[PDB]
């Protein structure tokens, strides 16, 4: 209008790299496990592990470096959990096509490694006990610096380090609250929390001796039906072995439960971290778009292709906006007295690049964004402080609320989870968690495999979690249950997709079927589908954008596959800290 | 089935028994772990090469001859075992 | 103060009986916020008030109880801020929103709160 | 015997053991240990004390020349 007025970069559409998920998208029924296939496994215990890991990631400064490269598999083998069972762990895993026996991890891999993992989980357990209870000297203590627990600390001569913390914990636990599975659940289906236990009100006080106040503040009161914990002997907490034995004295699932619990009260009471988190998240700033629990990067929710299309559209619009901004009457007349240095350097450099970019052609129009993102960041000062396409993993405001092993949201299905490792402070050298540009660049370096296993571990690959798995989460069904009455006490919403490269390609194969748009909508994606995997989605145009995201993630997974299998072999090559110099002399000798 | 952590099965009273039979009167508390590690080392070397004999023998049962051969090669020839 | 919860009992009776899918329908933008770093988003709080009132205004232990649900809610275990908030602080929030619906319904709570009739006067 | 089994786990799986072998293992062990401590006492006595300390142990081990 005035000077083709600066098109307002509305935060709603033009965020930082950080959108939200709002968790109410599937208000319509989407419960069908049509995505089921042979390469799906019921894992009742995963998301618990997930919270474990994400917590550990956000608290890197608190934790040992050996903790920093831990993986899902570490915990599986170390904690003795096998997938398959809707009821916990399918004890043992069958091997090959048929198996009368089951793999029985020790009978399946080198045992020192299993021992090694177990020691890690004992170490983390002890460390968590410390962080919960070494709080008498809160946060800063005589041994202030570093994680509170070390290898020698567990390998110390106390021989029963677990004793006193266990004592402290069984003291504070009864009042700190219990999980359902460690609650003495009601046999009496009458002392539901909602009603009460017994009728303490023998009778209502109808004949008030004070008729002047017929109102009664004691109409009908009861005895209270608080949930109870188990008996102490029925409390696995009261099993003496952990004092010396450590965490490996239980049923596996119970171990899981106690770990989740230890995380629970650590977050609720480890006053150092407990204040630290609130300092970090409830400082003097709110989300750029509005306060919300769960958020992801932009390309994670939309994909590289659509986000770069929309952000090229954004780039063109905002470049025109800047050109408007400089030669603007009030702006010009306030420029000569120099309002802001950014309002000077930005304007001059944006003019030079308008000259050099009107030279750039429309085919170069798309490329100029990705070539000039380096100089483009300093442009966004008066604009959003962070790019609509920026690095999420540099924000102390989008730090607590962030979930990262999310890998994709898909309509009528749910969400796709990729626990890979820590990406905060430490573990950034090849951290897969980064800005879309340099992320895809690193992917490029590993499709052409410029960097390999030796380079991979030379560049902090040992502090890089070696292995992985792949999971899908059914948000629609669980949210529907929650908003519809809590049918669950032990129902499952996590399923496994692929643990390794071979299964990775298997599932890529299987998912390309889903990405096949419903040509069966004009029928008359594979055969034998109503039996083992519902490849043909129900015939409609609902999945069009769903399949766009599906193709996008297929792309993502192909891109990942290179580096993922590269780690998969780097570990095999370089599991042990070894003077690989002689290993390279192997090649130079040949 | 797995095994672990019997290095603690070497008790302090046994340790100080050995020390006494060695003619030592007074002992640091730090000695025990030191000893356990050193013993770990010794035992590892000896078992290692003993096994080495075992496999090249294509057997699946460690024999006392393999054991004696190993410590004799080390330099502590043990008599009394053929 | 005891009565204060009584019509708050009444007040929340209204709303949880009032909306149809309050976990996706509810509105408290009459008192959006007094003076706050407005950390808990609405639908989070919709659950809790749904959970608080599905207990009801027990004025005894609910804040203890919902923590357990937050300890146990599959969707709500996912927040960590929901955990480093003990029922003590949960009061601060919970009362606030009690007050928020209170102030939203301050023209609607007393609509069925403070009138009692007697035998011999037409009302 | 259990320590024997644990350590030997590492190199090959599912090994069997002569009990006689177990014995031979031990005698070798304790004799070696004995020589170790007696030298350790030599260290301590030359060091003008009567309580043994690990530095003596390690220094003797340095002397004999096992690295």
From Swiss-Prot, chain A:
GO cellular component term of the entry, any: Isw1a complex
Keyword rRNA-binding listed: no
Location(s), subcellular: Nucleus
Keyword Nucleus in annotation: yes
Gene Ontology biological-process entries: chromatin remodeling; regulation of DNA-templated transcription; sister chromatid cohesion
Coiled coil: none
Ranges for region Disordered: 525-540
Protein role: Functions as a component of the ISW1A complex, which acts in remodeling the chromatin by catalyzing an ATP-dependent alteration in the structure of nucleosomal DNA. The ISW1A complex represses gene expression at initiation through specific positioning of a promoter proximal dinucleosome.
Other remarks in the entry: Present with 1770 molecules/cell in log phase SD medium.
Self-association state and partner proteins as the record states: Component of the ISW1A complex, which at least consists of ISW1 and IOC3.
Protein name: ISWI one complex protein 3
The species this protein was found in: Saccharomyces cerevisiae (strain ATCC 204508 / S288c) (Baker's yeast)
Swiss-Prot record, chain B:
The name this protein goes by in its record: Histone H4
Record location of the Glycyl lysine isopeptide (Lys-Gly) (interchain with G-Cter in ubiquitin) cross-link: 72
Subcellular location: Nucleus; Chromosome
Positions carrying N6-propionyllysine: 12, 25, 58, 60, 72
Modified residues (N6,N6,N6-trimethyllysine): 1
Keyword Iron recorded: no
Function: Core component of nucleosome. Nucleosomes wrap and compact DNA into chromatin, limiting DNA accessibility to the cellular machineries which require DNA as a template. Histones thereby play a central role in transcription regulation, DNA repair, DNA replication and chromosomal stability. DNA accessibility is regulated via a complex set of post-translational modifications of histones, also called histone code, and nucleosome remodeling.
Post-translational modification: Demethylation is performed by JMJD6. Monomethylated, dimethylated or trimethylated at Lys-1 (H4K20me1, H4K20me2, H4K20me3). Monomethylation is performed by KMT5A/SET8. Trimethylation is performed by KMT5B and KMT5C and induces gene silencing.
Residues where N6-butyryllysine is found: 12, 25, 58, 60, 72
Complexes and interactors: The nucleosome is a histone octamer containing two molecules each of H2A, H2B, H3 and H4 assembled in one H3-H4 heterotetramer and two H2A-H2B heterodimers. The octamer wraps approximately 147 bp of DNA.
One Gene Ontology cellular component: nucleus
Single annotated GO MF: structural constituent of chromatin
N6-(2-hydroxyisobutyryl)lysine PTM positions: 12, 25, 40, 58, 60, 72
Source species of the chain: Xenopus laevis
Family from the record: Belongs to the histone H4 family.
From Swiss-Prot, chain C:
Subcellular location per the Swiss-Prot or TrEMBL entry: Nucleus
SANT domain ranges (all copies): 36-100
Job of this protein: Catalytic component of ISW1-type complexes, which act by remodeling the chromatin by catalyzing an ATP-dependent alteration in the structure of nucleosomal DNA. They are involved in coordinating transcriptional repression, activation and elongation phases. The ISW1A complex represses gene expression at initiation through specific positioning of a promoter proximal dinucleosome. The ISW1B complex acts within coding regions to control the amount of RNA polymerase II released into productive elongation and to coordinate elongation with termination and pre-mRNA processing.
Additional record remark: Present with 1500 molecules/cell in log phase SD medium.
Subunit-structure text: Component of the ISW1A complex, which at least consists of ISW1 and IOC3. Component of the ISW1B complex, which at least consists of ISW1, IOC2 and IOC4.
Family: Belongs to the SNF2/RAD54 helicase family. ISWI subfamily.
Protein name, entry field: ISWI chromatin-remodeling complex ATPase ISW1
Source organism of the structure: Saccharomyces cerevisiae (strain ATCC 204508 / S288c) (Baker's yeast)
């Amino acid at each position: 209008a005035h000077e083709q007025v600066e098109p307002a970069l509305i935060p709603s559409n033009w965020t930082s790299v950080i959108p939200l998920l709002t968790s109410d998208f599937k208000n319509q029924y989407s419960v069908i496990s049509r995505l089921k296939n042979p390469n799906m496994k019921p894992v009742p215990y995963a998301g618990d592990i997930i919270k474990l890991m994400a917590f550990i990631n956000k608290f890197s400064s608190f934790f040992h470096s050996d903790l920093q490269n831990l993986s899902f598999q570490d915990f599986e083998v170390g904690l003795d959990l096998y997938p398959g069972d809707p009821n916990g762990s399918a004890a043992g895993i069958v091997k090959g096509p048929e198996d009368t026996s089951l793999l029985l991890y020790p009978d399946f891999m080198a045992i020192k490694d299993i021992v090694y993992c177990q020691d890690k989980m004992n170490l983390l357990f002890l460390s968590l006990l410390d962080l919960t209870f070494t709080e008498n000297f809160d946060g800063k203590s005589a041994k202030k610096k570093g994680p509170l627990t070390t290898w020698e600390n567990l390998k110390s001569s106390s021989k029963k380090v677990f004793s006193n913390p266990l004592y402290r914990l069984r003291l504070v636990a009864r009042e700190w609250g219990y999980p359902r599975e460690w609650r003495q659940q009601l046999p009496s289906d009458q002392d539901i929390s909602k009603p009460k236990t017994a009728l303490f009100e023998q009778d209502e006080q109808t004949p008030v001796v004070d008729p002047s106040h017929p109102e009664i503040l004691t109409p009908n009161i009861y005895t209270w039906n608080a949930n109870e914990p188990l008996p102490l002997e029925s409390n696995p907490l009261y099993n003496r072995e952990m004092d010396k034995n450590g965490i490996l004295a239980l049923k596996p699932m119970d171990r899981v439960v106690l770990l989740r619990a230890l995380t629970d009260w650590c977050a609720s009471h480890s006053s150092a971290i407990h204040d630290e988190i609130y300092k970090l998240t409830h400082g003097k700033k709110d989300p750029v778009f509005g306060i919300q629990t769960q958020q992801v990067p932009r390309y994670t929710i939309e994909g590289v292709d659509n986000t770069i299309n929309q952000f090229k559209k954004l780039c063109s619009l905002i470049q025109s906006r800047y050109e408007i901004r400089s030669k603007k009457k009030h702006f010009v007349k306030q420029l000569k007295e120099g309002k802001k240095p950014d309002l000077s350097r930005k304007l001059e450099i944006l003019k030079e690049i308008k000259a050099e970019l009107k030279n750039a052609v429309k085919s170069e129009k798309d490329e100029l964004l990705f070539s000039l993102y380096d100089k483009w960041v300093p442009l966004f000062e008066g604009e959003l402080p962070d790019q609509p396409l920026a690095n999420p993993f540099s924000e102390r405001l989008y730090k607590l609320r962030l979930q990262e092993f999310f890998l994709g949201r898909v309509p009528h299905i749910g969400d796709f989870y990729m626990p890979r490792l820590h990406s905060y402070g430490d573990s950034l050298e090849m951290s897969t968690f980064t800005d879309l540009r340099n992320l895809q660049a690193l992917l490029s370096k590993f499709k052409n495999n410029e960097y390999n296993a030796f380079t991979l571990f030379e560049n902090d690959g040992q502090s890089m979690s070696a292995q992985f798995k792949l999971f899908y989460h059914d948000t629609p069904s669980l949210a529907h249950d929650v908003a519809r009455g809590r049918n669950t006490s032990g129902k499952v919403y996590w399923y496994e997709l692929c643990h390794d490269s071979a299964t990775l390609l298997e599932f890529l194969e299987f998912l390309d079927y889903k990405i096949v748009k419903p040509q069966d909508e004009k029928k008359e994606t594979t055969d034998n589908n109503p039996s083992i995997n519902t490849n043909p989605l129900p015939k409609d145009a609902k999945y069009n954008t769903a399949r766009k995201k599906l193709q996008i993630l297929k792309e993502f997974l192909s891109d990942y596959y290179f580096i993922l299998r590269q780690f998969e072999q780097m570990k095999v090559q370089f599991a042990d800290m070894k003077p690989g110099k002689r290993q390279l002399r192997r090649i130079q000798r040949q | 089935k797995v095994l672990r952590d019997n290095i603690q099965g070497i008790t302090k009273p046994a340790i100080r028994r050995l020390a006494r039979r060695g003619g030592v009167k007074r002992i640091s508390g730090l000695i025990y772990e030191e000893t356990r590690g050193v013993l770990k080392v010794f035992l590892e070397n000896v078992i290692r090469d003993a096994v080495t004999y075992t496999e090249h023998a294509k057997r699946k049962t460690v024999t006392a001859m393999d054991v004696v051969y190993a410590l004799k090669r080390q330099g502590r020839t043990l008599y009394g075992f053929g | 103060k005891i009565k204060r919860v009584k019509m708050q009992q009444e007040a929340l009776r209204r709303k949880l009986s009032e909306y149809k899918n309050p976990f996706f329908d509810l509105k408290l933008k009459h008192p959006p916020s007094s003076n706050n770093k407005r950390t808990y988003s609405e639908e989070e709080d919709r659950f809790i008030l749904l959970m608080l009132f599905k207990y009801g205004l027990d004025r005894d232990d609910v804040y203890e109880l919902v923590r357990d649900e937050i300890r146990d809610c599959p969707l709500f275990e996912l927040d960590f801020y929901f955990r480093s908030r003990t029922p003590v602080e949960l009061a601060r929030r919970g009362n606030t929103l009690l007050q928020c619906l209170e102030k939203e319904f301050n023209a609607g709570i007393v609509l069925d709160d403070a009138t009692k009739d007697r035998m011999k006067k037409e009302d | 015997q259990r320590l024997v089994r644990e350590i030997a786990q590492d190199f090959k799986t599912d090994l069997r053991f002569q009990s006689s072998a177990v014995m031979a293992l031990q005698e070798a062990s304790e004799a070696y240990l004995v020589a170790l401590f007696e030298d350790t006492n030599l260290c301590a006595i030359h060091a003008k004390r009567v309580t043994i300390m690990p530095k003596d142990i390690q220094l003797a081990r340095r002397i004999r020349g096992e690295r």
